[PDB]
Structure 1
Amino acid sequence: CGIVGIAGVMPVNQSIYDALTVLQHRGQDAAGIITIDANNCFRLRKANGLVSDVFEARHMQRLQGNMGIGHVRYPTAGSSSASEAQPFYVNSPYGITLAHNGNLTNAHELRKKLFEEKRRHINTTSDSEILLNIFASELDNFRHYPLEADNIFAAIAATNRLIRGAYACVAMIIGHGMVAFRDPNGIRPLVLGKRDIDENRTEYMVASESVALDTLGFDFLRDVAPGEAIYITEEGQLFTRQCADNPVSNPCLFEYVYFARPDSFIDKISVYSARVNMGTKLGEKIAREWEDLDIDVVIPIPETSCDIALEIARILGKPYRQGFVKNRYVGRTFIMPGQQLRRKSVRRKLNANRAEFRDKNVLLVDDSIVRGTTSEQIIEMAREAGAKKVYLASAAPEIRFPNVYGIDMPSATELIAHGREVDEIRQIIGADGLIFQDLNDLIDAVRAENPDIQQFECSVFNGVYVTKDVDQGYLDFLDTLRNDDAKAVQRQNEVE
């Protein structure tokens, strides 16, 4: 998921729209924009689909005001395609809306506590609504009006004490302004920017990645610190505060591997440079451990791995060639009566340049291996194109554990690397050779760009969950949400 918040001095609807379009890679299932208009009323538009589909002209005239937030959704457990999208809002106290990228590992406990202690009903299975109501709950304790910046930060600190997990948040409070905060482990990305209009008026904005600042012409200020809260008033004043105890920087490693855009700077690390480094480490590991193998060419599985594969081919002194081409437009397969629905995917997504594989030992480079069924089909494509020996290299280490911090991933039993050594995986997907990035090499590659980062969020690779509340009972709660997600999507399909 991706989030945007613009506290400006002129209409922000188009800017939020433009900022979401450059974060569209963080989620293409749904989109939502909400603004505070001249009467201090939320104005909202959200629906399923791409940003360019969700917001028509008639919806943009509705989104009046100089302050607003936006959200694009990646389908996760609890926030399915058939579900209501973000942002949510409650009308008491004062009026609050919130957009969220991440996941709360104690969502179930929080929902119970909200109902019993506050009689606050949660109408969806999205943990973002829960986070919103916790925050609204803590804000309701203050009776005097208006709230002071210290009240709002106090409410944010109380929230960080109650909730566990990973979250980058932006929110608005009618009559006050815009806030943004980050989990105490700094897992999910969030950056702050500004744009000076004159010596009196300055606009601010936050976003999941710096590219959203670049595209609008905002000067980059800094990443929002772990546990830090940003508050920008309706007049245009910026306040900050540390709202967590023992904050630490444990940025998500997956952001650098493939999820974030290469032209972004997350916690002072160029995603592009990090990915080039990954290819250096992986190319070095390959030259060391596959010295005896005959590799004719290095070919990337586009698009994420093109720069990584270029560096590997350099380390190995081997040619780089564009053997696979990814179609920019995919298109849907229709549920067809009296027509065969036996087509296998991946042929839509990718195509093979037949001349680049014929009678060659090829080294394919992909960003990661999850289920392996996709990887199998890519290797099959190479063989059908004429490749003899087909070797596969993964920019990421083996993916053995589910992510519970905002990155949608299948359960452990669906991960091919779960409970298997490398050779088993190789034999299953049909490769002649298979190699994975060493986790220490991946850490070094990203850590090289910012040595201040001591540890990263590596749960999917090593099973170490930094929040320390991931047990089998919690994993079962998520599999329940996924069961209900499938039933809601299925019922929509029948009705169409």
Structure 2
Amino acid sequence: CGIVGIAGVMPVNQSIYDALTVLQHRGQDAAGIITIDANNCFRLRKANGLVSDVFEARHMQRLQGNMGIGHVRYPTAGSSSASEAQPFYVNSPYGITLAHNGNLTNAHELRKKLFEEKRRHINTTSDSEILLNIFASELDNFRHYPLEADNIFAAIAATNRLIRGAYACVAMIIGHGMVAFRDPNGIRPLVLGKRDIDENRTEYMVASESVALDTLGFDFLRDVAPGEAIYITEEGQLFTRQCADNPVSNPCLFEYVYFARPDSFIDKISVYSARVNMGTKLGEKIAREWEDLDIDVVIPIPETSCDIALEIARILGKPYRQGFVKNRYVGRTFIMPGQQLRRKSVRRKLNANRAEFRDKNVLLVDDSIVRGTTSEQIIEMAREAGAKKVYLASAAPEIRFPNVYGIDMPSATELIAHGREVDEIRQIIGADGLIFQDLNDLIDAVRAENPDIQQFECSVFNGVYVTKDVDQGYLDFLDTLRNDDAKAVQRQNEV
């Protein structure tokens, strides 16, 4: 998911829309924008789809005001396509709205405590609504008016003690202003920027990725620190404050491998350069362990892996060629009455340039292997194009555990690397050879760009969950969320 907040001095509706279009890669399922207008009321538009489809001229006319937040949704367990999008808001106390990228690992417990202790109903299965209601609960403890910055930071601190998981959040409180804050492990990304208007007026903004600030001409200030909160008043004063105990920086490694845009800087690390370093490390691993293999050409599975595969080819002294082309535009496969049922095909996303495979031993490079269904189909496409041997190298280590921090993944049983060794994975997918980045090399490739990061969030790779509350029990509460998601999606199709 992606989030943005703009505390401006002139209308923000178009700017938030623009920032969301450059964060659109963080989630295409739904989008929402909410502003505070001159009457101190929330104006909202959200709906399924891409940003450019969700917001029409009439909705922009509605989204009046100089402060607002936006969200793009990647479907995750509990927040399925069939469900209500973000942002959510509550009318009490004061009027609060929140958007968030991440996942709460104690959602279930929090729901119960909200009900039993506060009689606060949660109407969806989105942990974002839970998070909003905890925050609102802590804000409701104050009697005096207005709230002071210390009251707001105290409720954020309280929230951080109650909730666990990973989160970057932006929120607004009517009559007060905009807050943003980050989980105490710095897992999910969040940056702060500013745009000077004149001697007395500065605008501020926060976003998941720095490209959102770039595209609007905001000056990058810094990453929001692990556990830190920001509060920008309606009058434009900036406050900051640490609101977690023992904050530490454990950035998500998947942002660098695949999820974020290459022109972003996350926790001082250029995503582009991290990815080039991944290619260096994997190229060096291939040169040492596959010295005996006959490789004619190195071919990326676009788009993420193009620069990774270029660096591998360079280390190996081998030609780089664009043997695959990704269709910029993908369409739906309709269900006509009867007729051909053809579906679940990878040619809808990729086309092979036949001349780049014919009678060649090809080294394919992908960013990751998840279910392995897609890589099996890619290998077959390469053989149909005339490849002799097909080798596959993964920029990411083996993906063996589910991500419960906001990156959507199948359960452990649908991960091909779960319970299996490289050579077994190789035989299932039909490759003549298969090699994965080593985790310590992936870690080193990213630390190279900021050696101050001592540990990353690696759970999908090694099963170490830094929030220490993930057990097989909890993994089964998540399957009963994915079960209900798929029924809600399913009952929309019947329509």
Say whether the fold is shared (TM-score over 0.5): yes
Q: Residue by residue, what CA displacement relative to the aligned partner does 1:280-336 show, whole Å, maximum 9, x if unpaired? A: 000000000000000000000000000000000000000000000001000100012
In the alignment, the residues of structure 1 paired with residue 430 and residue 373 of structure 2 have an alpha-carbon distance, to the nearest angstrom, of: 10
Partner SS state of residue 34, structure 1: strand
Q: CA deviation at 1:337?
A: 1.4
In the alignment, the residues of structure 2 paired with residue 395 and residue 208 of structure 1 have an alpha-carbon distance, to the nearest angstrom, of: 23
Q: Residue by residue, what CA displacement relative to the aligned partner does 1:42-68 show, whole Å, maximum 9, x if unpaired? A: 000000000000000000000000000
Taking every aligned residue pair, what percent have the same amino acid on both sides? 100
Q: CA deviation at 1:472?
A: 1.1
In the alignment, the residues of structure 1 paired with residue 442 and residue 220 of structure 2 have an alpha-carbon distance, to the nearest angstrom, of: 27
Partner SS state of residue 169, structure 1: strand
2:420 is aligned to 420
Q: Residue by residue, what CA displacement relative to the aligned partner does 1:199-219 show, whole Å, maximum 9, x if unpaired? A: 100000000000000000000
Partner SS state of residue 477, structure 2: helix
2:303 is aligned to 303
In the alignment, the residues of structure 1 paired with residue 336 and residue 410 of structure 2 have an alpha-carbon distance, to the nearest angstrom, of: 28
Q: Residue by residue, what CA displacement relative to the aligned partner does 1:213-251 show, whole Å, maximum 9, x if unpaired? A: 000000000000000000000000000000000000000
Q: Residue by residue, what CA displacement relative to the aligned partner does 1:439-490 show, whole Å, maximum 9, x if unpaired? A: 0000000000000000000000000000000011111111011111111111
Q: Residue by residue, what CA displacement relative to the aligned partner does 1:232-286 show, whole Å, maximum 9, x if unpaired? A: 0000000000000000000000000000000000000000000000000000000
Partner SS state of residue 392, structure 2: strand
Which stretch shows the higher mean deviation, 370-379 or 472-481? 472-481
1:2 is aligned to 2
In the alignment, the residues of structure 2 paired with residue 162 and residue 103 of structure 1 have an alpha-carbon distance, to the nearest angstrom, of: 14
Q: TM-score, normalised by structure 2?
A: 1.00
In the alignment, the residues of structure 2 paired with residue 119 and residue 395 of structure 1 have an alpha-carbon distance, to the nearest angstrom, of: 48
1:262 is aligned to 262
Partner SS state of residue 159, structure 2: helix
1:136 is aligned to 136
Partner SS state of residue 329, structure 1: coil
Q: Residue by residue, what CA displacement relative to the aligned partner does 1:39-98 show, whole Å, maximum 9, x if unpaired? A: 000000000000000000000000000000000000000000110000000000000000
2:146 is aligned to 146
Q: CA deviation at 1:150?
A: 0.1
Partner SS state of residue 125, structure 1: coil
In the alignment, the residues of structure 2 paired with residue 289 and residue 117 of structure 1 have an alpha-carbon distance, to the nearest angstrom, of: 59
Q: CA deviation at 1:436?
A: 0.1
Counterparts in 2 of 1:13-412, with a 5 A limit?
13-412=13-412
In the alignment, the residues of structure 1 paired with residue 407 and residue 479 of structure 2 have an alpha-carbon distance, to the nearest angstrom, of: 15
In the alignment, the residues of structure 1 paired with residue 272 and residue 256 of structure 2 have an alpha-carbon distance, to the nearest angstrom, of: 8
Q: Residue by residue, what CA displacement relative to the aligned partner does 1:362-381 show, whole Å, maximum 9, x if unpaired? A: 00000000000000000000
1:462 is aligned to 462
Partner SS state of residue 475, structure 1: helix
Q: Residue by residue, what CA displacement relative to the aligned partner does 1:105-132 show, whole Å, maximum 9, x if unpaired? A: 0000000000000000000000000000
Q: CA deviation at 1:3?
A: 0.1
In the alignment, the residues of structure 2 paired with residue 225 and residue 341 of structure 1 have an alpha-carbon distance, to the nearest angstrom, of: 50
In the alignment, the residues of structure 1 paired with residue 486 and residue 348 of structure 2 have an alpha-carbon distance, to the nearest angstrom, of: 24
- Consecutive unaligned residues in structure 1, runs of 5 or more: none
Q: Residue by residue, what CA displacement relative to the aligned partner does 1:174-197 show, whole Å, maximum 9, x if unpaired? A: 000000000000000000000000
In the alignment, the residues of structure 2 paired with residue 222 and residue 353 of structure 1 have an alpha-carbon distance, to the nearest angstrom, of: 43
In the alignment, the residues of structure 1 paired with residue 389 and residue 292 of structure 2 have an alpha-carbon distance, to the nearest angstrom, of: 14
Q: CA deviation at 1:343?
A: 3.3
Q: Residue by residue, what CA displacement relative to the aligned partner does 1:320-360 show, whole Å, maximum 9, x if unpaired? A: 00000001000100012121113332101000000000000
Partner SS state of residue 397, structure 1: coil
Partner SS state of residue 386, structure 1: coil
**RMSD (CA atoms):** 0.4
In the alignment, the residues of structure 1 paired with residue 193 and residue 331 of structure 2 have an alpha-carbon distance, to the nearest angstrom, of: 36
In the alignment, the residues of structure 2 paired with residue 205 and residue 332 of structure 1 have an alpha-carbon distance, to the nearest angstrom, of: 36
In the alignment, the residues of structure 1 paired with residue 89 and residue 473 of structure 2 have an alpha-carbon distance, to the nearest angstrom, of: 30
In the alignment, the residues of structure 1 paired with residue 45 and residue 289 of structure 2 have an alpha-carbon distance, to the nearest angstrom, of: 54
In the alignment, the residues of structure 2 paired with residue 217 and residue 272 of structure 1 have an alpha-carbon distance, to the nearest angstrom, of: 21
In the alignment, the residues of structure 2 paired with residue 343 and residue 13 of structure 1 have an alpha-carbon distance, to the nearest angstrom, of: 39
In the alignment, the residues of structure 1 paired with residue 138 and residue 31 of structure 2 have an alpha-carbon distance, to the nearest angstrom, of: 27
Partner SS state of residue 256, structure 2: helix
In the alignment, the residues of structure 2 paired with residue 406 and residue 213 of structure 1 have an alpha-carbon distance, to the nearest angstrom, of: 22
* Runs of 4+ more than 2 Å apart: none
In the alignment, the residues of structure 1 paired with residue 377 and residue 455 of structure 2 have an alpha-carbon distance, to the nearest angstrom, of: 35
Equivalent pairs, count: 495
In the alignment, the residues of structure 1 paired with residue 466 and residue 338 of structure 2 have an alpha-carbon distance, to the nearest angstrom, of: 52
Q: TM-score, normalised by structure 1?
A: 1.00
In the alignment, the residues of structure 2 paired with residue 204 and residue 195 of structure 1 have an alpha-carbon distance, to the nearest angstrom, of: 6
Partner SS state of residue 347, structure 1: helix
In the alignment, the residues of structure 2 paired with residue 58 and residue 487 of structure 1 have an alpha-carbon distance, to the nearest angstrom, of: 33
Which stretch shows the higher mean deviation, 342-351 or 277-286? 342-351
